Write a protein that binds this ligand. Structure first.
Ligand SMILES: N[C@@H](CCCC[NH3+])C(=O)O
Ligand SMILES: N[C@@H](CCCC[NH3+])C(=O)O
Ligand SMILES: N[C@@H](CCCC[NH3+])C(=O)O
Ligand SMILES: N[C@@H](CCCC[NH3+])C(=O)O
Ligand SMILES: [Cl-]
Ligand SMILES: [Cl-]
Ligand SMILES: [Cl-]
Ligand SMILES: [Cl-]
Ligand SMILES: [V+3]
Ligand SMILES: [V+3]
Ligand SMILES: [V+3]
Lengths: 255, 254, 253, 254
């Protein structure tokens, strides 16, 4: 119930599973792949907490889903074909908004990032829900404006139907000249399959990533909590490409 | 569809199991009455499981029936849940054929160490139970037949109940079940389940129940029941078939 | 040097939480036994190597063969070589480490009671070195509460040498009832690999090592500690065979 | 005791491998040049392993020979070890018959995906290497033949060295081996081994070495070498058969 109670409980949940040594091994993996998964073997939150977060997200989707179907010029015209729930609607959730600022959760994850995780991001990008449900729905190749995202894989299709996360770490976002396909020609793609209930941390500014299009009608739902690193602060947003908040963004080209 | 399911299931099993590793599962099945197929030791492709669950979700929506009763043949333990009857489930081509698959039954017989025979009373070949209210439960009981494959289609968080509790190496005397005396004499093993798990159960000699939901949640299973040779030619007794008939003779008001 | 405590403290702090030590305390009470293996280390590699080397010298210099039966434990055998506690105590490394406030302070989170390095001078330490077929540390209990056992060298499991234990027992020296206790209680068998350590509740855990099925090498170091319940206890038994092979309870064979 | 081995081995492998799981080991062998048979993937029964190890330990005590040289056909990389020659090992009836077992060779051909032919130069059929001293090593090299089954009979702890380092998808040019250049162009995969492991190695296209021992310790292997079709009627060139002839022209002193 009380926000101090979830923090107090989460602190114990993590202390039952992690040591400074094992977190340092997760930090190595995060640096190597841009990505670290918390699955059935290595949980991040109590199952009752994730259940509460999923049910709140199910409600926001029912009440506020907005279909997007566009190409984004700042990422080489890669597609966005999904429904979204905007950040300002998600922020009305006391659970999601407080958990996304938990000193316990941010303090734990900073041992994986090896730097301070700062909950000071543009108010249109604190949270995002994506809800894919039709064949060929996809979150096309892109980067993030900020350093970090904790992605909740709330509902995942069987791997045979797509929806895996593909990633190329150790890259960067040149919005004037993204060179996405030339980068794929130069770099190996790592494909990360996900199961419902998984969570994963993603270094979104230096990891080029997409979700594999759904091969048939199927449900893929995630919650993205975005955070900044120090390098993101006092840096100006550019690109006029904030399509999830504004489907009429200058860089969005509708289909 | 078609015979492609069996051919693909065979490959899926051959990628994961060997005679040596199946014999190790057989030892566990015999020690615990129970073996679990979880995220690390899967039993069916996720695509196949998904199709089964969608079939069951539809059957629940069209045919679910509430049950709220005590069964006198099991010490008046409760049954509080919704069910879908075997004869409705049987209309599913997917579930009925998979339940008779020579690939699936032949694999699982390496665990039972005896032939799994798909010839059971037509009111008990399949069952779906669907719990969703606080205190919903499948109270302590045994099964009339030797085997069940349980699909843990949807499980609540462990903190909300819904685990399977089991005491292997028991027997069901319907005139004197001795459930609470048996618990005083034997240790209880509690098995937590997660959505997507499956598990094989020795239902005739394992006393078992589902831990009641501690709050409104959702717990949904599909039960595929099979016979062993010892179950054939034997007559059903007890007038206690509460899932097919809510007013079976043994069923009592709460 | 004298920096072991600083090194050990940092080593343990990186691998344990109070919550994870509480899980070990549960296991210790339930089994009388808790094993520090590759997944749950207790000392750095450098310290293990140093302790093992010191013990390897002590064996080369002071090994003493024992082959007897002990009447206070039902005439169960002792077939092994030993190095007496007084020889081992001359090691500044082993004696210092066996009194480290970091080691004893951490392990007290497992025992859940103070660990007291106030033990009879002939039982503070023991090395046992089994080398021949049928060598065994037969069924027995300890006079004190606690032992930290260093599995310095262990044979492959197929050659024997595992620890067998039955927790929640006690040592009646006039009527040990070992075989009758085995008939009433389940035996837990614990295999060990070289470099393992384990903590043992020696006064309430009946235990033995499974005899060697063939000539092999099994070498351990025993640091024995007291609990409060042990202090000012009168040692009874005339059975301290490892310090004195002519103890009265020792029947040779 | 000679046709019994073939029969006992076939049943041992039938219980632990399916065609599908062998196909997965073939992918790894192709990709890495290397497949490990460890506790999770046994290749021979423990009794047979023990018999071979005891035989090799006798051959070592009786016939071990020190080698301490640089090999000019592999860029002067070192060979610092003891060896037992193929001629002495060949007198073992157990090792000899096992190395030609149609069961063993037939099983492993599911991993190589081609026939494994026990038709190699008599001086290379078998080899024991026995490393005992700090900086003992089998320096960077290739094999003249396609295949080797290595028995990791005794391995030091990983912290003391003795791992197998490998670069697959290479070739051995004995006039210009370009070892260090190849290391600059390619990633090195390091394979730790434990006593009791076996591993299959594609010796002609995998550049490999053993990491030098960082202190006195014991590392003992048995190499069974086989040919593939590409190797039949092979011209052996280089004057570099240092294990069999320490006065080989290509063998230099340190
Ligand atoms: N920059 C991302 C949007 C991230 C929204 C959530 N932080 C894209 O181009 O799709
Ligand atoms: N005998 C069980 C019912 C099993 C029905 C499905 N095989 C009970 O009393 O609850
Ligand atoms: N009481 C043990 C000897 C323990 C000596 C070392 N603490 C026995 O009878 O074998
Ligand atoms: N070609 C190897 C010798 C392998 C001998 C055993 N087949 C080397 O240069 O060391
Ligand atoms: Cl992003
Ligand atoms: Cl049942
Ligand atoms: Cl003792
Ligand atoms: Cl070679
Ligand atoms: V992204
Ligand atoms: V003892
Ligand atoms: V080689």
């Amino acid at each position: 119930m009380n926000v101090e109670q979830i923090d107090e409980n989460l602190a114990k949940f993590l202390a039952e599973r992690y040591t400074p040594e094992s977190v340092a091994q997760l930090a190595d993996r995060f640096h190597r792949f841009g990505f670290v998964k918390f699955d059935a073997a290595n949980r991040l939150v109590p199952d009752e907490l994730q259940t509460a977060v999923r049910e709140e997200c199910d409600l926001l989707i029912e009440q506020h889903k907005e279909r997007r179907n566009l190409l984004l010029s700042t990422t080489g015209n890669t597609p966005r074909r999904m429904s979204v729930v905007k950040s300002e609607e998600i922020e009305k959730s006391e659970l999601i908004s407080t958990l996304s600022r938990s000193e316990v959760l941010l303090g734990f994850l900073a041992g994986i990032t090896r730097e301070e995780i700062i909950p000071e991001v543009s108010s249109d990008e604190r949270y995002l829900i994506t809800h894919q449900e039709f064949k060929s729905d996809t979150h096309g190749w892109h980067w993030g404006d900020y350093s970090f995202a904790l992605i909740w894989a709330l509902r995942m299709p069987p791997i045979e139907h797509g929806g895996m996360l593909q990633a190329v770490p150790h890259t960067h976002w040149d919005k004037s000249n993204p060179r996405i396909n030339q980068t794929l020609c130069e770099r190996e793609i790592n494909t990360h399959g996900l199961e419902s209930g998984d969570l994963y941390l993603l270094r979104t500014d230096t990891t080029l990533h997409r979700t594999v299009p759904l091969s048939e009608d199927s449900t893929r739902t995630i919650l993205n909590m975005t955070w900044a690193a120090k390098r993101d602060l006092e840096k100006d947003l550019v690109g006029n490409d904030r399509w999830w908040e504004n489907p009429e963004a200058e860089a969005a080209r509708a289909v």
